[PDB]
Design an enzyme around this catalytic site. Structure first.
Site, mmCIF file in Angstrom:
data_model
loop_
_atom_site.group_PDB
_atom_site.id
_atom_site.type_symbol
_atom_site.label_atom_id
_atom_site.label_comp_id
_atom_site.label_asym_id
_atom_site.label_seq_id
_atom_site.Cartn_x
_atom_site.Cartn_y
_atom_site.Cartn_z
ATOM 1 C CD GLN A 37 25.339 -5.320 6.076
ATOM 2 O OE1 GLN A 37 25.178 -4.683 4.909
ATOM 3 N NE2 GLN A 37 25.518 -4.734 7.163
ATOM 4 C CD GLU A 104 42.820 -15.890 11.502
ATOM 5 O OE1 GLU A 104 44.051 -15.899 11.145
ATOM 6 O OE2 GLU A 104 42.239 -16.967 11.701
ATOM 7 C CG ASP A 152 26.520 -23.851 4.725
ATOM 8 O OD1 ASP A 152 26.162 -24.355 3.825
ATOM 9 O OD2 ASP A 152 26.344 -22.605 4.795
HETATM 10 C C1 LIG Z 1 38.328 -12.194 3.900
HETATM 11 N N1 LIG Z 1 37.891 -12.794 5.279
HETATM 12 C C2 LIG Z 1 36.356 -13.193 5.128
HETATM 13 C C3 LIG Z 1 36.267 -13.698 6.480
HETATM 14 C C4 LIG Z 1 34.941 -14.117 7.034
HETATM 15 C C5 LIG Z 1 34.958 -14.924 8.337
HETATM 16 C C6 LIG Z 1 33.416 -15.165 8.360
HETATM 17 C C7 LIG Z 1 32.812 -15.970 9.308
HETATM 18 O O1 LIG Z 1 33.434 -16.740 10.045
HETATM 19 O O2 LIG Z 1 31.359 -16.061 8.959
HETATM 20 N N2 LIG Z 1 32.827 -14.894 7.314
HETATM 21 N N3 LIG Z 1 33.854 -14.126 6.564
HETATM 22 C C8 LIG Z 1 37.762 -13.539 7.227
HETATM 23 N N4 LIG Z 1 38.472 -12.899 6.268
#
Ligand SMILES: Cn1cc(-c2cc(C(=O)O)[nH]n2)cn1
EC number: 2.7.11.23
Length: 340
Positions: A37, A104, A152
């Site tokens: 998550q 970030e 991906d």
């Molecule tokens: C809003 N937000 C989502 C992310 C984020 C980064 C990743 C990942 O690297 O898997 N997944 N979601 C960063 N900022």
């Protein structure tokens, strides 16, 4: 499960308001995946919002996330401004038997942006801004020291920095690897999956350029270019647009005969519904001579026939069936489509 902290999916049970190590306040769940998550959290110590990726408490995902951490840290080492198109990993830690990657905080993904257009697409000028950034990101990833295949690329894995600017970053190196083991795996999300991967051939960095070409057409039209219900439908939809792949590719392809038939003369055709091969022209999908996708850009700035012809040329070079001659990021950036 895990002193009551885990559900039967080995995911951490997120409680809005929870405070970690007297430092992080969990705000909410912003993301779910096979890895685990993603939560929004306020870092009391640095006085900033962060995205915390909570890896499932299962050794396979923990081991994969350890490769993810290694690749993100490898990219972070580099003394270049090109690394600012990749999500910044601030640090990681083990917490309640979960590996946590602290990123970030970014904004909406490009899929959210398409939903906001009601799936009618963004201007060619905005598509151009996104294309330039993504080609620079892939130029960075193909740095020899790195040689990272994302594996991906898709609108959901490209996030705006913030909801006001055009600045973007690639996230989710959870499926990523370095070039080395030239092997076949069932990888990439189907709509963005390269012919070499469909065909069971070994992959290299060119699979990310295939995905990017599909992404950029969808950003402008509002819809996936190649929306297969399965691999056969996916290859059939690619062939509608690009025609039959070259014989020299199909002769080497372990899964050639899943989609194609070799005829007595050594030529190949589609196996036994669909528009005939090469009939669904990108020329027509983009509405080059008819004011853009479904004619909606009729008399708009920087939507000329010549602008559409440059875009179409760049996309056709990204959607080369041959991974050897598929346009490489440096040459994409030199394309006349970017000359303003
Ligand atoms: C809003 N937000 C989502 C992310 C984020 C980064 C990743 C990942 O690297 O898997 N997944 N979601 C960063 N900022």
């Amino acid at each position: 499960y895990n002193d009551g902290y885990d559900d039967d999916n080995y995911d951490y049970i997120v409680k809005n308001g929870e405070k970690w190590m007297d430092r992080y306040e969990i705000d909410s769940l912003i993301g779910k995946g096979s890895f685990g998550q993603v939560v929004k959290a306020y870092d009391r110590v640095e006085q900033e919002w962060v995205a915390i990726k909570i890896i499932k408490n299962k050794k396979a995902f923990l081991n994969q996330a350890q490769i993810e951490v290694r690749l993100l840290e490898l990219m972070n080492k580099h003394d270049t401004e090109m690394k600012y198109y990749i999500v910044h990993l601030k640090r990681h830690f083990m917490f309640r038997n979960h590996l946590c990657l602290v990123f970030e905080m970014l904004s909406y993904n490009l899929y959210d942006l398409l939903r906001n257009t009601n799936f009618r697409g963004v201007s060619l000028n905005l598509t151009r801004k996104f294309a330039q950034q993504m080609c620079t990101a892939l130029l960075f990833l193909a740095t020899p020291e790195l040689s990272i295949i994302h594996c991906d690329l898709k609108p959901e894995n490209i996030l705006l920095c913030n909801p006001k600017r055009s600045a973007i970053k690639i996230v989710d190196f959870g499926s990523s690897c370095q070039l080395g083991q030239r092997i076949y795996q069932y990888i990439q999300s189907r709509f963005y999956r390269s012919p070499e991967v469909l065909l069971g051939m070994p992959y290299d960095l060119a699979i990310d350029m295939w995905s990017l070409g599909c992404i950029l057409v969808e950003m402008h039209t509002g819809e996936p270019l190649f929306s297969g219900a399965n691999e056969v439908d996916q290859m059939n939809k690619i062939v509608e647009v690009l025609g039959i792949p070259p014989a020299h590719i199909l002769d080497q392809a372990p899964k050639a005969r899943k989609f194609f038939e070799k005829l007595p003369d050594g030529t190949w055709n589609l196996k036994k519904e669909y528009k005939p091969p090469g009939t669904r022209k990108l020329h027509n999908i983009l509405g080059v001579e008819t004011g853009g996708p479904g004619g909606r850009r009729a008399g708009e700035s920087g939507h000329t026939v010549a602008d559409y012809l440059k875009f179409k040329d760049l996309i056709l070079r990204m959607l080369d069936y041959d991974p050897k001659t598929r346009i490489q990021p440096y040459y994409a950036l030199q394309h006349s489509f970017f000359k303003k």
